[PDB]
């Protein structure tokens, strides 16, 4: 029975052959030479130039079909072209993390003999979003079309859209509320959803009633299908015009070219050696306003992600996450594919922007993700809807590590202290201004600030780790899809991390609920803990907080001519809105994660997008920059002196200027205070060691270590050595008093029948 | 099939068992009769035996 | 959802008429030669012929180095290039 | 490729945007490191050779006489041998209360110090802030970077390794 | 060149920041594939209107015209007085959803207009609803700011010309080429519609010429005194972008897809004091050609000065010899400025500037084509700068174009495309027809009635303006169209 | 093109015709007289007695396939035989409320042109539990097989099992925890889940990872499929022995 691949081999035989060559030889598919590229270089780039333009243009055109602004204006969609074995050749920009996620679904089909059943046929249509096979979160939905030529498969197209909602318990796309997979939303596992280019009615009727924002989902489906088919047609025209021979060579030489590309850029931009760095984020599920149904999920915890980054003389490199913490009862878990494609999107943004963007760099990187950590769970009950919470707090560390190598070597233009927490996600549900069931999810946190450089300040309100082409979207467009009105949009002062170069500031949006019925809202970002750290000096960006006002009496206040709250929440420590709202129930605290809360018309919700970390000692910053930050609204005048040692005087014009003698003398005095207030690290260490031996820390600090030691013995060994702790000191998780469900017992997806999962990671 | 509560009696096709392919006949016999007792599509080999 | 309505209105107008001249020999007339200029390109000076654009005829050829001049256009054909004129008063650059 | 004064401007944070884009968007200049490190050298007030920059005011350095490798501030202070964590021989300020966090953050935008701490690390002689960590309570000090200096100079740069004692 | 007017802006109070935040987008607008992902590449330009010339009024109108927060007219009077005091040179007003209900934005405009009268100052006011009544507030505000920033200086020009010509006996109203390739009236106050009128002139002539001679795939290349304009005509048509970007600005007006680089016959040749590298432009000398023209007072050499040194230009045939161009002026100023600081001859001084430009223009033209997914051999290259026929060899050498054509009228090629432009009037009216799939044939005729009416209301508009231009209805050919989704 | 029902009419035309007769006439399908029963009462009861025995005996046999005691010992399972228009003719005892639920699912398909897409083909297999169409609760999962004769549909078989759990927020079948449909467990809307008598692998993998008690769910599928197919085979033998007319 002939296999369907161009060879006559099956999908499985074909890929198994290619991975064997790759393993044995060290080069993708065994390609020790690139025949087309070396011998017919003109033909090689013409294919590259024409096909990469095709997918770029497909994404840009098709996104005019969607109703949701996330797809139509922000561009949270991607199109990828794959070879037979599910390796990408080329991609449009956008949410390119799904280069790898959709590649792994293609491989899951390959490895579980979809070929025999349900069959991969021409004109078929597959839809998938299953996180257990490596997708980021259910709200990101794939369409996958096989491409055939003269009767045989020659590759695949994938299209991803980020969809408003998938019917989880939480109303929104990064939803809280649910604590397991069951309730985490509509989960599609590589389903055959069409044949002969036409969708199945039983998929249409079932799928559309599993969600709130049906019209939005329906159109997000057509944006995918139209893109896939523009790309399928593109390929056929390219093959018919240049030949299957060349196309077939290109479909694999391109992928080894991407591996060759990563190696060469490492060797030219980096330094061999070892780099160590760590990242944390908070999960405050103890609080009253995280109302979750399962009692075993109400505890505070901290995500712990240490990375040992090894860079070798031959230009390979290794990322070891030994020491990391366990998955939990929340929606912040991830998958080994999620995680590693995340690290790949980062190398598309600094290491290989000017090389082939495809799975080549993936084959040139080594990943060790211990089984059972949050980044590699071993449990099929796990939940995913806001994977970015953990994911974006782990990858930010690696910017710093990678930036020390550019800095030592002299490529200071490339240093970057890391990504912002891509957060607060305005979410809610109910009846909207068209009186339809609806959900919300602002992609304003596509435009957080970004890490400072060794050369200049980070960009404000500019980007996210998962899409560098930032877009905040127009106020006038968002108000077509949410039942809220804007009372402010404002640069978020003192959100940027301080330094010689200041991190990018976030921004803020103040909303009034308007024309909503039976409406709820919630918040979802980091509160207690800043994920990014500064670099070579350099402080973390600000962390998160919440602001909601209920019963504002704002109908009367608007109408009677009284003061009403406008703009941003400029100094949350000295607020101005609260005085204006004497009757309101104001929620102003650090609890940056909540579940659904009744809101009504004229209630208030502050949307806050985070800043980025800074670079260098702050009192090396040029004083004039500090003064300009004060006028430009970037830094509150209070910290000009307290952080930068800059003394500013207001001119007749009302703007701030530099007092130079004052600024020098204040900097001189800060240096003596630093000497006087610090102590030798020897001294501090024996103090902290006493606290450790006494087990003096909150339950969430003690749980992070207990769980981390159990998954990563080399990390426990290192902690014990560092603090010089007796073997009599032990930290069993079960002694901390907090629930410990899922700490010993777990069941993996691979323990279910007929499941063959693909491994991409050392594990 | 592995998780079930009831079983089927089967007359052994072999006198004597022993060698690999013979265990293959014993499973095959089972399947066959399960198709007769119930319905061809009742068969759930993926659960194991 | 019908979102708008449109109405266009065309009236005829004399459009510029592209010449359709009869093509003649490739050798251009002696009348078109206007001398030479010192022309410097790849560290080399050459005496580049000068041609009156209007005095060129359909079908002519001009081997570089030459500059083709009229009242207000200067067409540069360095050594290593060639041009010919067609019946529509269009020139054609060849690599050559 | 790049003019020397242009790589200086890059160090001084004063480079023009055209050349900043040129540096980013095109293949890197193999010569960068040797021009960079020489630019830093002439700005130090001590003649001992620089081996690798660790931060804006922090370096791995070769003692002119003993040939030992050490971590050094720009001011002069040697912290430790180059294979050791410099921070272990530095002075540290720990922000573990709301009062101290609210000196560099407005309230509500500060982290909560029972979850996350700011550890600032200074040179003993000049008070320069060479690095700030943001871990949890209990968390070890972090050895940021252990560079393979030999391979870098020898295999990637085509340069002799500087003389080295222990 | 950001040489507009010191213009100020009034928007909704609490949202003054949105102009300068550039919707984030404008830190990567018009970026090649590689820089879209290369994060450290993103960069914000200065805002057209700085923060100290923005002010806010307290008003709020929702997506269907309802006035949730009624306009507190006092805040509008302080807004006006602030910018009048700041000596603003024009004032732009952009309030959210004013395209839907312009009541509040036109009251603000009237109040501002009142305050400028009292001040005695000459400050014009631009309500966004009066100019670009379309959604997306960053697009609308940028476009409206253009009327204050850049349009106002050349506002004089179309009435100076039209007056000078009717004075002289013309019996028609001038039309202007507009961003979508069609002509509009010279009278329209939205001069920003006419901002890329010159380049689009060239693209239209090349389109016309192609149609006569069957060239369906043409790459247009124009070199003027200041820049190098480039567009592609793909299968008989130009591409028109709906909510485009241009000069890293989001805009609300439909635009023909083009590209350029800021070099031309008059671009100024300078050496970086520290690098001693040659930088062409970005400014130009313009009608003053450079040093070669004695009376121009131009002291810095221009590419046109290298033309004279190398023998490209004829000293005695600039404008037919109506303009005195002296080669020895070019030689002395090339030596002093370029040749001797670089230790080169005047020949090699001039030839290296031309060689750099040749390669710079060539790599751009090659790359705009590569980027759009095409090979240069799929196209024919029309070249028509007026100074472009001086470098046709340069930027085309070895690109593999099917053919490279220099039409004899290259120097007025845009004015050729303008005389070739269709005499066409267009008229639009929006609508609210909503149909399910399954609908009875009475809801179906009602819908067809109301669209049928709008075409008739529009049809009398097209014919009524053609009457005022001396055309009876018999000469007008009519083509109805509609917008669906 | 021609409808699939034994008449040549489509499923929708066929039922629409019959509901109109019933509305106008007051008697199911217009039957003011019962031809077979009045004229061949012996043949009428012989068909009745043999077919009701078939569904009783199918339910009894197939329930020995399940691991869950809910099906195997308690018998919370049911088998129902339907005409083309989705009206029950006979049922086994047990959870017979699904006589009406599976009938409403069959009719939902009729009304939404399942015939055109995804098609009702011989040997196909449908799975459903959607409560918005009139099912009791997600945990009661239907298998629905069309029965064909000489190339035309002549009726359907439905099988119901109560399943231990369907992956709601609550662990259990009468679950609390969730407060909306979103979280109330795996909801299947008349899915075509098999063709040519064989289940689809993408349905198998997806469905088994949406629930907790997987092995139990898998075997509850085989108990359903087996009963349907014992009943499909039954009818064909009855028709081959007594005639399609009767
Ligand atoms: Mn997403
Ligand atoms: Mn039940
Ligand atoms: Zn020091």
Residue numbers in the entry:
A (entry chain A): 14 to 776
B (entry chain E): 573 to 621
C (entry chain B): 622 to 717
D (entry chain C): 2 to 167
E (entry chain B): 88 to 572
F (entry chain D): 14 to 259
Task: Give verbatim excerpts from the published study on this entry.
ACs contain metal ions but not organic cofactors, and use ATP to activate substrates through phosphorylation. The first structural rationale for acetone carboxylation is presented here, focusing on the 360 kDa (αβγ)2 heterohexameric AC from Xanthobacter autotrophicus in the ligand-free, AMP-bound, and acetate coordinated states. Like many carboxylases, AC is a heteromultimeric enzyme complex. Its architecture consists of two heterotrimeric αβγ subunits joined by the interacting α-subunits to form a dimeric core.
In the absence of bound substrates or nucleotides (ligand-free form), the AC structure has an open cleft at the α/β subunit interface leading to the nucleotide-binding site in the β-subunit. The ligand-free structure is assigned as the resting state awaiting the binding of substrates ATP, acetone, and bicarbonate at the nucleotide-binding site. The ligand-free form of AC contains α-Glu89 positioned at the C-terminus of a Mn-proximal α-helix (residues α82–87) which blocks access to the Mn active site from the α/β interface. However, the structure of the native AC shows the nucleotide binding site located ~40 Å from the Mn site of acetoacetate formation, with no visible pathway for the transfer of reactive phosphorylated intermediates.
